[PDB]
Design a protein around this ligand. Structure first.
Ligand SMILES: [Ca+2]
Ligand SMILES: [Ca+2]
Ligand SMILES: [Ca+2]
Length: 589
């Protein structure tokens, strides 16, 4: 059995297997975009396979078929004839795709080219687990997403991700079927304090590169505009309004011309228009009409519109939310789970749907903005877990419109959490066990992007077990770290425990699967050595009970010396805040 993330909705292996031939025949249907074809080329190339595109199934070699349901193409036809399914499948499930591997034929059929890309991405992961010279097991996956909108947002308080960081995060998410990177960096004025202003050319070309990466990975770049805080859209006259709408179209047109294909509207921390929240709906509908018109020129453009209201922390009862709920179905209402540090929670979600509803307007499910693994209230820490705290196992997916994570300023460190959201949002975790398994596997993928366990992934997981707690008050549920060590803490066994951690941090520092990652978390890896020295000494503790005590004191102090820039000051890395650091102090005296 292959390890596949996110977990396929359904997968069965009828026995049997086959060797994939050195030369591959590829068939495509009309509608398969260049990005899907490119991914296919990349997948075969990396397996050292040679491929030719044709318009027919070629007997006596492995066939690779990627197609669209109801396209009337060869692939569409083959699946009808050979791979039994119900047509209603593609209507009733989102991002619906079937992956079929049987006796020489490798096929994907999807409702659209995006979901075709998802199916091919499943095969990418399968091709990284091939045995005995490209031997692949017969299987069928009938797959679909339970949450339509899945990804992450640069919306924290901290240093922006670098342009390279952003590309890297979209690449990562692009391997796990995420479909949104929401661009909202606070240091870009063009999205807020200069929202009316067009980008100059050199900045525009950087956006272009982000949008492009977004399209190539399907981890689509979403440009978020806030036109309500600073010289806002005017609703005092029709004249003013039409002018202002026109400024938005001008902003969006420039971005459309530079490969941007999805938008979002922010409205937090600002007054509503004169007359209140009903005017948002007016604006969103008009924008939607425009976007629809833009699809003639730009067919891949999404009309889905996320709207961040000024009471995202609310329960859905407010008058503003009720008004917004009267918007059309392409509008999503962003909430943080009933308080700032809220969670993907069935109770919250169901109440929100009851509370926001009005006569003639049933309450839509909330679109969650989750402040996890967000560390802007925990700046010294990495938050390397918390899966099931923030992404509750068992939540009825009809109560979730979307999920995007608000992560850490250190771009690379967020990969474990991206891997959580990707799996969960695609296939709701059944239970805590599934959440924990995801967490466990995440480090393999974070470290080197495959199901293979390496020493580096082992070591990264090991230190991460102790870097989870946020050391915050009760505004957020506390995340539990050092779960196995903490009982033991409540001596020579303990030296084993601590030297084991010291070696894992050292090993990871010296031999990371990903050098970008290691460089970004170097502060914590160095902090670990000193932290482990501090504790180790004390545990050793007549001449030697002084010495191993006094070594420790010095190490602990050195452990607080590893600083990185945080916006306008320096922060110092800290590891094992929950149990390890207190224990060093408890032993201290
Ligand atoms: Ca069909
Ligand atoms: Ca569908
Ligand atoms: Ca032992």
């Amino acid at each position: 059995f292959y390890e596949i993330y996110p977990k396929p909705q359904e997968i069965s292996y009828s026995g049997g297997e086959f060797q994939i031939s050195d030369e591959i025949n590829i068939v495509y249907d009309d509608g398969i975009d260049t990005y899907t074809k490119k991914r296919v080329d990349e997948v075969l190339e990396a397996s050292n396979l040679e491929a030719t595109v044709s318009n027919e199934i070629v007997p006596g070699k492995t066939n690779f078929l990627v197609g669209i349901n109801e396209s009337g193409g060869v692939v569409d036809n083959y699946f009808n004839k050979n791979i039994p399914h119900d047509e209603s499948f593609f209507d009733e499930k989102m991002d619906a795709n079937i992956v079929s591997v049987k006796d020489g034929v490798i096929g994907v059929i999807a409702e659209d080219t995006d979901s075709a890309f998802y199916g091919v991405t499943t095969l990418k992961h399968v091709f990284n687990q091939l045995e005995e010279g490209n031997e692949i097991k017969n299987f069928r996956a009938d797959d679909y997403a339970e949450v339509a909108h899945r990804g992450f947002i640069e919306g924290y308080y901290g240093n922006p991700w670098s342009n390279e960081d952003r590309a890297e995060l979209m690449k990562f998410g692009g391997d796990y079927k995420l479909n949104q990177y929401v661009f909202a960096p606070k240091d870009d004025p063009y999205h807020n304090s200069k929202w009316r202003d067009l980008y100059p050319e050199e900045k525009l070309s950087e956006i272009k590169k982000l949008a492009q990466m977004g399209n190539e990975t399907k981890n689509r770049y979403v440009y978020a505009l806030h036109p309500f805080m600073n010289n806002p859209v005017r609703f005092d006259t029709e004249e003013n309004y039409q002018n202002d709408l026109g400024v938005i179209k001008a902003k969006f047109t420039q971005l459309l011309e530079n490969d941007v294909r999805q938008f979002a509207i922010l409205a937090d921390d600002a007054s509503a228009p004169a007359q209140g929240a009903s005017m948002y709906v007016k604006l969103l509908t008009d924008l939607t009409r425009w976007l629809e018109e833009q699809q003639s020129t730009y067919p891949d453009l999404k009309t889905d519109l996320m709207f961040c209201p000024s009471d995202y922390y609310g329960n859905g009862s407010s008058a503003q939310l009720k008004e917004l709920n009267k918007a059309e179905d392409n509008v999503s209402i962003v909430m943080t789970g009933g308080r700032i540090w809220g969670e993907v929670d069935e109770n919250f979600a169901n109440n929100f749907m009851n509370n926001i509803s009005t006569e003639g307007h049933p309450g839509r499910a909330p679109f969650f903005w989750i402040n996890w693994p967000c560390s802007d209230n925990s700046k010294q820490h990495l938050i390397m877990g918390g899966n099931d705290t923030f992404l509750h196992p068992g939540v009825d997916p009809s109560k979730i419109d979307g999920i995007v994570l608000n992560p850490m300023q250190q771009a690379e460190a967020n990969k474990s959490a991206l891997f959580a959201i990707a799996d969960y949002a695609w296939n709701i975790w059944d239970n805590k066990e599934e959440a924990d398994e995801n967490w466990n596997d995440s480090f393999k993928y974070m470290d080197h992007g495959t199901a293979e366990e390496t020493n580096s992934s082992l070591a990264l997981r090991e230190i991460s077990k102790h870097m989870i707690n946020q050391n915050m008050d009760g505004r957020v549920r506390p995340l539990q770290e050092s779960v196995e060590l903490a009982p033991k803490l409540e001596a020579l066994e303990l030296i084993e425990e601590f030297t084991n951690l010291q070696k894992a941090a050292e090993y990871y520092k010296n031999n990371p699967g990903n050098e970008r990652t290691r460089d970004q978390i170097i502060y914590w890896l160095n902090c670990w050595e000193d932290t482990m020295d501090a504790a180790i000494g004390y545990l050793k503790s007549d001449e030697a009970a002084w010495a191993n005590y006094s070594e420790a004191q010095s190490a602990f102090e050195k452990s607080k010396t590893y600083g990185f820039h945080y916006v306008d000051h320096t922060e110092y890395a800290e590891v094992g805040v929950q149990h390890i650091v207190p224990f060093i102090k408890s032993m201290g005296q």
